[PDB]
Write a protein that binds this DNA or RNA. Structure first.
Lengths: 248, 248
DNA sequence: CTTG
DNA sequence: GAAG
DNA sequence: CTTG
DNA sequence: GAAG
């Protein structure tokens, strides 16, 4: 089966990802920026108990680490933790937005390629490491009142809510999939951050190409959702569109 | 004096005007218009007693007359009577606006002409007769509760609040002053509806021209305010501007 | 939480 | 006077 | 009166 | 949600 044939490529069986070929990312600040430390708004016990198992898992995975940083931004409960990084985003140097919009991305799908595989990369941003010099930027406070732990944590991987994460991830995955494109010139591969479409001319080519892509992704340290995968179908949902008979 | 030398031209001594050379005006309606009869909002006794002497004077002068009309628009007290003619204005055919704006009008004042007379025509619109076919358009209700008179009145002269009155008056006065301009080619005469500026090169020319203009205006049936007149001055107020040394 |  |  |  |  697709599950047991590629255990490394699936998030369900391969563990948390880590893009081993990508250097830890340095995040340049604007020329005038200095650290901003925003106080954490007091969190209700209900919210803290909701957030706590997520924090603990991320600590166990090494995605969060303790730190002392002159930067601090608040967490809010939404229960899953959401960090308000807007004041960090204002202080980070802008980069050119290179992710194409879906309309233009789908214009590269020719009618000759009507067999599709759609993969969704799980925890994609967390596969990209942050350089230790840039980790303090993303610090937040974590207090366990009944555990006597009050201090800061920060991210060792590209965080959610950071304005440049989608673009940096898309660029990284393009670098890591460049060779795959060269080895498979007959395949169409569309990338939209963590959402991938592979298109082939026949079911057999789509099966062979999907095998190669899963092998490559897992080897590089990325992880796809086996639950969401649409493998070798002539009809797929991709980026809000239904792809069918070369339409949409 | 200027007062006693031209008794016909001044409103103070010449009676209410009447432009005897101008045919009574016919007011064309839009192609689809039918009469509109708006009910009179009840008027307080204080307002009615304030308005009443004005109505009576206008009746005595023949400027208002009794009528029965399928048109009716309301009076409001402001105490002087103000008629809301907006629903009549909507039904009257539009005419080209030919009154120049003051900025452009004053561009025709050359620096060689620095002696000024400014005249203000009193009750200017009321000098222009309305044709009997057009009088019913402007009817309103007048009730004297302690006199047992409830019926409509209307205007026999061009009314205040009618959208085309300024343009029709300006055009009429231009027709009536055309010959004066020909007989006095050295004088500058600016007309802005009822506000007139005569400009001359010398005090003597301004005196002679102002004498001729007053004679002509009074003969034609127009009336100027002796109280407001600025006669043969090198500094005058005209249309919100102070005219001085060829400036403004 | 704050930032038609 | 919806989004981080 | 009604029509920033 | 100033003007006739």
């Amino acid at each position: 089966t697709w599950l047991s044939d590629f255990p490394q490529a699936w998030a369900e069986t391969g563990g948390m990802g880590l893009a081993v070929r990508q250097a830890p990312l340095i995040i340049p600040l604007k020329a005038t920026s200095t650290p901003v430390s925003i106080k954490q708004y007091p969190m209700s016990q209900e919210a803290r108990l909701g957030i706590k198992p997520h924090i603990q898992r991320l600590l166990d995975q090494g995605i969060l680490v303790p730190c002392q940083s002159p930067w601090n931004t608040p967490l809010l409960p939404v229960y899953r933790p959401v960090q308000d990084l807007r004041e960090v985003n204002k202080r980070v140097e802008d980069i050119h937005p290179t992710v194409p919009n879906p309309y233009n991305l789908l214009s590269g799908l020719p009618p000759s390629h009507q067999w599709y595989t759609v993969l969704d990369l799980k925890d994609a941003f967390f596969c990209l490491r942050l350089h230790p010099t840039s980790q303090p930027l993303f610090a937040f406070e974590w207090r366990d009142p009944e555990m006597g732990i009050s201090g800061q944590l920060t991210w060792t991987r590209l965080p959610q809510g950071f304005k440049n994460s989608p673009t940096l991830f898309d660029e990284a995955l393009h670098r890591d999939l460049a060779d795959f494109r060269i080895q498979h010139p007959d395949l169409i591969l569309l990338q939209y951050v963590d959402d991938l479409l592979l298109a082939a001319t026949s079911e057999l080519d789509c099966q062979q190409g999907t095998r190669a892509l899963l092998q490559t992704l897992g080897n590089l340290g990325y992880r796809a959702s086996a639950k969401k995968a649409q493998i070798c179908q002539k009809q797929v949902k991709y980026l809000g569109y239904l792809l069918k008979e070369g339409q949409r």
